[PDB]
Write a protein that binds this DNA or RNA. Structure first.
Lengths: 148, 89, 204, 267, 54
RNA sequence: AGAUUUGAGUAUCGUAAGAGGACUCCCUUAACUUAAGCAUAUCAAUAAGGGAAGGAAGAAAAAAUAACAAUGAUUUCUUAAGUAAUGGCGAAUGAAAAAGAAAAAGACCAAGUUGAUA
RNA sequence: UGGAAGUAUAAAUCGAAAAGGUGAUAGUAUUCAUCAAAGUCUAAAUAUUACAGGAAAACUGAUAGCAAAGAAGUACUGUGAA
RNA sequence: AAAGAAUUUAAAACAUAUUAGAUUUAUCUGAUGUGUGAGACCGGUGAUUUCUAGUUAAUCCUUUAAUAAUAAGGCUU
């Protein structure tokens, strides 16, 4: 909305809101990220202190598909099936049917351990597990499978 | 139940199904190789290889072969054909 | 087959027998017009492989080209350029001499179509090629299903656009894969497509 | 924030506007519509296999490929020369990947073949195939009778045992363990006897006269994968004691120990 | 330039549901400039049998 | 005298040229500008100069990806992505496999075989 | 060239094969995986601000909109390009 | 020393053997057995992972199919 800008409220003012001593000239210190170490150094020092230099080894053709490992914590495991299913099997133990929360179907590969789990047995089928994730699943009375 | 994702034995359990075809020559290419060889002979650099091999300098032949062929593996394959020709006279 | 011993023979160019023959041929071509017609190919195995067929409408032309590198065409070697572009020597043409020679035969013979060309010989100054040309208006070429594709109008001056094998290797169409990312379907067309700024009708 | 804008080159000649997008939809649609009018299965989008995706990121998802391998056509008893003429894609470039992939795409072709109805190459009723089909009706009935007869005896135990286990799960959801153990024993015995039998090389093309029920494609009729519901398992004591972390770290450490083994044996 | 604009679908349906519901209020319908004094019911629904003969 | 090889003149039947180049395929080592100077770099397959075609042109059927529960000619769109990488590692430049779609189609030469050979 | 001990082209020299190429950190070796170069054609999906014929418009309304709403690339200038 | 069924029917490479047709050469080309490479165990066997004590080998990370010794790149000063 051009009618809502400051140009329409600065009609009549000579400098159009830019000052009389310091005019609105073409450049205010260069074109782009100029002077990264000379006159805009204090800007880069203040707001991007690690902009200049090198760090870490070069990976000539990085395979970002090999680093794709979505993770879900234990506290969010039962939300994969539902709250009604959770209450349906809330009184199961060893010997009877226990629902299997396979996480690869939901797009989660590694299961992490954070938060708390409901006091029910469960079978967690996932590609990778954490050391503290397996403890919480087994301490509640469940099992940790593996896939692929 | 459903393998494992790490190690040498990694992946979903499945029966993988690939022929390793060998691209090679027939038994008549042996004759064609000889017939052309008599009609042509050896290259200028091939002949200098024969002189080096005669005097028992096998390492200096490979270095000379590498210089004119640009491959260590292709240098051996020439140092064998040349040394085979010496035993054929 | 006869043409399997010839192919094996022709790979031994350094042999004395073949070096003598190329010595004689390069002498004759030095005292002949630069582009002229020969009765039959002097390398009938290579000509047949590239497409030559002993039928009406198939002709063979020999072109002699001065190999080596030339200077940048600037008067007195004076270029008003930055030091990054001030070199006059050591600059090599992108188009191979085979493609360059193929065009000279094409311009000279404007009523025919260039099919392919093969190397013949060279000396300290010249390099000699042999160009296979086809007459598109011959009734034999037109009525043959396997070769009347050359009668298409888009094949006019085939080597000038860069459709012959000699001229298509300079374009970069020698292989496939990640080595030829910039030469997918054409270097300039690929570059334009990558540089397109797609402004969708509904955008944020 | 440090800005990174590649507008220093001439972008104004690099701008592509999509004003033809609304008219592209009408143009493409009027080509699909006018393609079926020529011959309706022209736009049938010839059948394609059910192939897995690549990489571990997508390896569990099935998707359509192009063309069945020559081993898949032979497993389903389909001529590879006739496959392209009945709306089947063929890919001789595809080398077979697994036994499980060969079985799934052999069932895909088998299911498609039963649905497929091939009209005669000549509309007139005096075509050879229609005439020949009437010339083997008595032989077909005799051939059909023995096929049903000798298939009715070999399955006299698996069918009844499968019936028994079906009701056992019902009474267990309205004992069960016996039927599953009993069924598995029968299945092993049947497969054992099969190994301890030359078949037809090619099946018959289903050729018949019928009303023209015109369908726009065949890959939507045969779904890629069956729907997935909630799965449940019996929590035994063996699964309770499986150490997934130890099994993963053992597999990781074993693969990282190949260096020391080769280093030790080389000294 | 940017001729056409983008709007979330759920916000588009929120407005339509708030615009159908606004047509059942005779005060707002009349204020918009509509002569609805003589209509029997403000959510005027006609028989589907009568429409089919038009 | 005869059998061939090569090269010419003439006659007959045709073929090329020139216009246009918005889109298509290419040859060429511009500079202003940016880097707050400037010399590599950027501008930039950009301008100008030159060649060739069509209603579209180019590409097209793996000496290709990938390391997987694997794919599968070419072309175009979405995403990967301003990412990996390149750079007085400064200014700046900058892809591709995977994954989702539009459309789908594969055929031949040479080499080899058959020679009362055509 | 994004291709970094060389991604592609070309020139000088050199130059293979009882095959071989690639797996982008150079080198050798042993395995593994995947293809089989150096000849040709190939529709469909895609581009278009030449030009011609049409339809539309939150576009301009004779100092605006094409330079040109009339015999407009016209009158007029230059040796000429213009 | 202690916990441990492990998932379920359409198969191609050929390490080898025996034959069939040929070649003399760095010699090949076909066809049939076999195992490989196989996986459906019957409270107990058990493939498989822990803990303890020695021995042996490797031990800062990377060169993205796996290793090795050179080389190169990482991290701190």
């Amino acid at each position: 909305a051009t009618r809502f800008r400051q140009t329409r409220r600065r009609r009549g003012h000579v400098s159009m809101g830019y000052g009389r001593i310091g005019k609105h000239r073409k450049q205010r210190g260069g074109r782009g990220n100029a002077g990264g170490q000379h006159h805009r150094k204090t800007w880069f020092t203040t707001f991007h202190p690690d902009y200049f230099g090198k760090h870490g080894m070069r990976v000539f053709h990085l395979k970002a598909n090999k680093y794709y490992c979505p993770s879900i914590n234990v506290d969010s495991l039962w939300s994969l099936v539902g709250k009604d299913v959770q209450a349906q099997y809330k009184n199961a133990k060893v010997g009877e049917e226990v629902p299997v929360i396979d996480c690869v179907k939901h797009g989660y590969f590694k299961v992490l351990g954070k938060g708390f789990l409901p006091k029910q047995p469960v079978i967690v089928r996932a590609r990778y597990f954490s050391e503290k994730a397996q403890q919480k699943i087994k301490a509640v009375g469940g099992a940790c499978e593996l896939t692929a | 139940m459903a393998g494992i994702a790490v190690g040498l034995k990694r992946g979903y359990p499945v029966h993988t199904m690939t022929a390793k075809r060998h691209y090679g020559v027939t038994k008549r290419k042996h004759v064609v190789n000889d017939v052309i060889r008599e009609a042509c002979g050896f290259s200028a650099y091939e002949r200098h290889m024969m002189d080096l091999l005669r005097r028992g300098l096998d390492k200096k032949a490979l270095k000379y072969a590498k210089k004119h062929l640009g491959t260590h593996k292709r240098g051996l394959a020439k140092r064998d054909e040349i040394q085979r020709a010496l035993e054929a006279i | 087959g006869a043409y399997k011993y010839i192919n094996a023979l022709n790979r031994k160019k350094q042999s004395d027998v073949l070096r003598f023959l190329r010595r004689i041929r390069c002498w004759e071509l030095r005292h002949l017009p630069r582009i002229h017609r020969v009765a039959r190919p002097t390398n009938p195995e290579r000509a047949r492989r590239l497409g030559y067929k002993p039928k009406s409408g198939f002709v063979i032309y020999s072109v002699r080209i001065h190999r080596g590198n030339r200077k940048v065409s600037a008067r007195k070697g004076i270029v008003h350029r930055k030091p990054a572009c001030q070199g006059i020597h050591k600059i090599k043409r992108v188009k191979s001499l085979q493609a360059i020679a193929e065009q000279r035969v094409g311009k000279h013979c404007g009523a025919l179509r260039v099919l392919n060309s093969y190397f013949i010989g060279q000396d300290s100054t010249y390099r000699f090629f042999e160009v296979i040309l086809v007459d598109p208006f011959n009734a034999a070429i037109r009525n043959d299903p396997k070769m009347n594709w050359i009668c298409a109008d888009k094949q006019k001056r085939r080597e000038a656009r860069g459709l012959t094998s000699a001229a298509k290797k300079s374009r970069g169409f020698t292989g496939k894969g990640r080595r030829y990312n910039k030469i997918g379907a054409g270097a300039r067309g690929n570059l334009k497509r990558r540089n397109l700024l797609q402004l969708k009708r509904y955008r944020s | 924030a440090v800005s990174n804008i590649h507008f220093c080159k001439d972008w104004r000649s690099k701008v592509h506007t999509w004003f033809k997008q609304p008219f592209r939809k009408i143009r493409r649609h009027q080509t699909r519509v006018e393609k079926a009018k020529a011959v309706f299965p022209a736009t049938i989008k010839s059948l394609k296999p059910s192939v897995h995706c690549m990489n571990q990121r997508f390896n569990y998802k099935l998707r359509l490929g192009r063309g069945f391998t020559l081993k898949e056509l032979r497993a389903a008893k389909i001529d590879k020369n006739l496959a392209r003429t009945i709306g089947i894609a063929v890919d001789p470039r595809r080398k077979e990947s697994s036994k499980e992939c060969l079985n799934r795409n052999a069932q895909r072709l088998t299911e498609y073949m039963n649905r497929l109805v091939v009209l005669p190459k000549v509309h007139a009723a005096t075509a050879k195939r229609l005439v020949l089909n009437k010339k083997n009706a008595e032989a077909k009935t005799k051939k059909a009778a023995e096929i049903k007869k000798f298939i009715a005896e070999h399955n006299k135990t698996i069918k009844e045992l499968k019936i028994k286990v079906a009701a056992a799960k019902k009474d267990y959801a309205k004992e069960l363990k016996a039927c599953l153990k009993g069924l598995k024993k029968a299945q092993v015995a049947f497969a054992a006897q099969v190994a301890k039998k030359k078949t037809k090389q090619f099946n018959k093309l289903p050729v018949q006269q019928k009303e023209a029920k015109q369908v726009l494609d065949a890959n939507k009729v045969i779904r890629l994968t069956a729907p997935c519901t909630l799965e449940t398992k019996t929590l035994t004591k063996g699964m309770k004691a499986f150490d997934a972390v130890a099994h993963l770290r053992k597999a990781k450490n074993v693969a990282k120990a190949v260096s020391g083994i080769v280093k030790g044996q080389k000294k | 330039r940017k001729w056409q604009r983008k709007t979330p679908k759920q916000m588009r349906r929120f407005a339509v549901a708030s615009c159908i519901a606004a047509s059942a209020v005779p005060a707002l319908v009349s204020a918009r400039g509509h002569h609805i004094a003589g209509v029997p019911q403000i959510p005027l629904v006609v028989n589907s049998k009568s429409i089919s003969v038009i």
